[PDB]
Amino acid sequence: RMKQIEDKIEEIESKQKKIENEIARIKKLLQLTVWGIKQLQARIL
Amino acid sequence: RMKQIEDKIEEIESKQKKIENEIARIKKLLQLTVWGIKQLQARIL
Amino acid sequence: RMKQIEDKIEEIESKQKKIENEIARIKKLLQLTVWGIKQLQARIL
Ligand SMILES: [Cl-]
Fold first, then answer.
1. Which chain C residues are within 8 Å of B9, Cβ to Cβ?
2. How far is CA A12 from the centre of its chain?
3. Cβ atoms C9, B9 nearer than 8 A
4. How far apart are CA C40 and CA A41, in angstroms?
5. Where does the record place it (chains A, B, C) (predicted)?
C-alpha cells in the first residue's frame, strides 16, 4: 500500500515537472508575441 | 493517514488533469495569436 | 515513512496552487494580447 502511494507520487511529480516546463515555454512565447505586437504598434505610430 | 493520503492523491490527480486541459487551451490560443501577428506582418509588407 | 509521504503531498499541493496562479496570470496576459491584435487589425480595416 505505501509502495503504491510512493509510486503514484513519482508519477504525479513527473507530470508536475512536464507542466512547469510547458508553462516556461508558454511564458517565453507570450513574451515574444508581446514584443511582436509592440513592434507593430510602433510601425503604425 | 494512508487513506487520507490516497484521498489527497485522487484530488491532486483530478486537478492535474484540469491543469493539463487548460494548458492545451492556452497553447492553441497562443498559436492563433502567433498566426495573427504573422498575418499582420505579411499585410504590412 | 508516512510523514515523508505527507510532506511530499503537501509540497505537491503547494506547487499545484502556484501552477494554478501562474495559469491565471498567463490567461489575463493572453486576453490582453488578443485585444491588442484586434486593435491592430482594425487600424487597417
Ligand atoms: Cl512496502
1. 9
2. 16
3. yes
4. 7
5. Virion membrane; Host cell membrane; Host endosome membrane
**Experimental technique:** X-ray
Residues of A in contact with C29 (CB under 8 A): 30, 34
Q: Exposed e or buried b for every residue in B5-30, given b needs 16+ CB within 10 A?
A: beebbeebeeebeebeebbeebeeeb
Query: Structure resolution in Å?
Result: 1.5
Nearest to B19 by CA among C39, C13, A44: C13
- Domain extent for B33: 1-45
Q: How does DSSP assign C11-45, residue by residue?
A: HHHHHHHHHHHHHHHHHHHHHHHHHHHHHHHHTT-
